[PDB]
Amino acid sequence: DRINTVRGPITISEAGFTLTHEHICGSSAGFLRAWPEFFGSRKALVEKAVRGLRRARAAGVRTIVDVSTFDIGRDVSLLAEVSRAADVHIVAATGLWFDPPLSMRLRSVEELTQFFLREIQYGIEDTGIRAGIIKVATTGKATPFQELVLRAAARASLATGVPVTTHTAASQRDGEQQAAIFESEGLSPSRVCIGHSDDTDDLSYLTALAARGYLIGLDGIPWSAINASASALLGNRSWQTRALLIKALIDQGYMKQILVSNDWTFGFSSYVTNIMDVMDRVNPDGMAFIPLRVIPFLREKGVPQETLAGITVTNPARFLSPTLR
Amino acid sequence: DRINTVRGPITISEAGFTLTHEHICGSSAGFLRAWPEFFGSRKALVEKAVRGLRRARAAGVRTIVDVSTFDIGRDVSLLAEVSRAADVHIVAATGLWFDPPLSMRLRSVEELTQFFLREIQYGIEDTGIRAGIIKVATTGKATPFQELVLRAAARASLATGVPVTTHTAASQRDGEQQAAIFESEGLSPSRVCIGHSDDTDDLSYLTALAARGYLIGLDGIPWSAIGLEDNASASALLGNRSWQTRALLIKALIDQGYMKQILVSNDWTFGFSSYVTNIMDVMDRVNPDGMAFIPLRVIPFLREKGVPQETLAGITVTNPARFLSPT
Numbered sequence A: 001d002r003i004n005t006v007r008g009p010i011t012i013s014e015a016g017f018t019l020t021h022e023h024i025c026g027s028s029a030g031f032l033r034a035w036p037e038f039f040g041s042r043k044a045l046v047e048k049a050v051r052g053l054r055r056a057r058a059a060g061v062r063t064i065v066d067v068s069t070f071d072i073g074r075d076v077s078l079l080a081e082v083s084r085a086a087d088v089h090i091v092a093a094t095g096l097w098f099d100p101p102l103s104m105r106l107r108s109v110e111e112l113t114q115f116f117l118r119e120i121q122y123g124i125e126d127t128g129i130r131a132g133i134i135k136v137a138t139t140g141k142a143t144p145f146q147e148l149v150l151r152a153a154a155r156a157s158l159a160t161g162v163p164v165t166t167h168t169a170a171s172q173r174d175g176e177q178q179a180a181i182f183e184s185e186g187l188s189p190s191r192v193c194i195g196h197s198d199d200t201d202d203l204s205y206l207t208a209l210a211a212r213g214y215l216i217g218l219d220g221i222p223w224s225a226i227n228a229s230a231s232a233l234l235g236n237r238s239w240q241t242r243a244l245l246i247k248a249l250i251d252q253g254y255m256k257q258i259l260v261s262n263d264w265t266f267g268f269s270s271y272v273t274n275i276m277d278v279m280d281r282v283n284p285d286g287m288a289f290i291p292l293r294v295i296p297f298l299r300e301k302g303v304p305q306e307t308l309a310g311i312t313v314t315n316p317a318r319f320l321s322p323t324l325r
Numbered sequence B: 001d002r003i004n005t006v007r008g009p010i011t012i013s014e015a016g017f018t019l020t021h022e023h024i025c026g027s028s029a030g031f032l033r034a035w036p037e038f039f040g041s042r043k044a045l046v047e048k049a050v051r052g053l054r055r056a057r058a059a060g061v062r063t064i065v066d067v068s069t070f071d072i073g074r075d076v077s078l079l080a081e082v083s084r085a086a087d088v089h090i091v092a093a094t095g096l097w098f099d100p101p102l103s104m105r106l107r108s109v110e111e112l113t114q115f116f117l118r119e120i121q122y123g124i125e126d127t128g129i130r131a132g133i134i135k136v137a138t139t140g141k142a143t144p145f146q147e148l149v150l151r152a153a154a155r156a157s158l159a160t161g162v163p164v165t166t167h168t169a170a171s172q173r174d175g176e177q178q179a180a181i182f183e184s185e186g187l188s189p190s191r192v193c194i195g196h197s198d199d200t201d202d203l204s205y206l207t208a209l210a211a212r213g214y215l216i217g218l219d220g221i222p223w224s225a226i227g228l229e230d231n232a233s234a235s236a237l238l239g240n241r242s243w244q245t246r247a248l249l250i251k252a253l254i255d256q257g258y259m260k261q262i263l264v265s266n267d268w269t270f271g272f273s274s275y276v277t278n279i280m281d282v283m284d285r286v287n288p289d290g291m292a293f294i295p296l297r298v299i300p301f302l303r304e305k306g307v308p309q310e311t312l313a314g315i316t317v318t319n320p321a322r323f324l325s326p327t
């Protein structure tokens, strides 16, 4: 039941404090290799990533789950280099996000299942690095292709025991549609995380999924823009409003169904040019925002350490551990 | 006299018979590295590519211009490996086609000009291999992003002298909007090939572009789905126009007095992942000659139709030579 990382298999006890939805670099397939000067240089991106992960480590984080898929420009060699120099375990991902190229979008469910399985059972590229999580996406009502991906992600999870994590348009209640698709394939709700759930205030949506066994991804707490580009991406809602949703779900009793993270990055190319510079101004803490700002905020709101350590250590370790239920 | 190939700089006299629009692998950025099993294996694709290029070489081909851009999944390491093993010069490309990812789509004209210049002046990725052509595209009326890419291509061409080649929806007469954008930037027509021009029978459209100095890419001569109208996917891609109809356009433009403006190719590939699954198998059944189709079938066909050997040698050797030479 060992969890696969970019450096090799680790046990449940070695995982520790885990951020379930992070990115070393938010890019596009082949971009980092073709145009490293966009990030200054590859060396400059590595140096920035090592510094940010070491800051996260000093604050308490032992493992981060890089949910960067093929189309988000996942570079496992970059992930391996920064994991080694920072002494933070990184769990790599397979799956598809909302920017698949023609070679991915014209594939059948059988073919996409084989691709996700290739990255989990054999390895990513020629590196032998196996993925320990599957990332998928929907932005409103699922397109015939997005449904096909969710099904392929479910089938790949049922043959390996590896978990599935999603990107949602939470306000449009995507988690319910994704649920219906995952359940029709026979996937256990305990192997799924309905991510970006901190984008909505609808508690009757979050509790309904958490009661069925789904893990709720309140994975982007520092995302706030309190000018168009930063506002359209990060949103109008504050970090406190997103952190009060962690509190609200513990008050509903569904404490064991919570996964917290930052959804941060050290390189961003899939959006406008200076978005990374604006993001580093909004949150200078980076990935260290959860143990330095969110946890002490929840402690001052009435949530004990036994509960917060269960959300950060026990919940991700149970989520990442290969099993069918 | 000098052009950049995947094996390094060569003199233009060494280029010889050149196919101006080919692909070793029609894919997507990062696809070949992440899923080589789609093509059997990377080794299987290489061996298939080497066999095909060696057969094309035995038929007379000395150089092919791989117009695969970043988003067509250009893997220059593969291009170099196959070029060396087959002993056929391969010119690599920069530019952007019609499947750019978000990291390319959100860029400004200035940023894309810098990316194209990097691949031409510095190198592709960390390989040191420099692009000798810029490939761009439109599929009907140009989107604001396509117009931006064409401007960046024009600016990269003006600074380096490397030619620009295009994908067009010839039936929509795309070459005219492309030409208008290129000339508004000050780019000379002699540095541009309006490709996929064999997809139209409109001689008025072709001759007018040729009269302005544009090179006309009659680049997919074996593309035909005749006999397989049963297959919806093969018909939508390959079309229902015969290889003979496509080849007769070469003769039509020669007869109009535009022999110096013609560039001929197959637009072939050894790996195809950017469309339906078994398309490569279907294509190999329609044309077993592959890239060798031009010298084995098209040249003897045109000779039998009355076109002199010297005119055909001028189209396959002299025209690509003048086109690829930086100026």
Ligand SMILES: [Co+2]
Binding pocket: A167, A168, A196
């Ligand atoms: Co997301």
Ligand SMILES: [Co+2]
Binding pocket: A021, A022, A023, A067, A263
């Ligand atoms: Co994310």
Ligand SMILES: [Co+2]
Binding pocket: B167, B168, B196
């Ligand atoms: Co084309």
Ligand SMILES: [Co+2]
Binding pocket: B021, B022, B023, B067, B267
């Ligand atoms: Co082509």
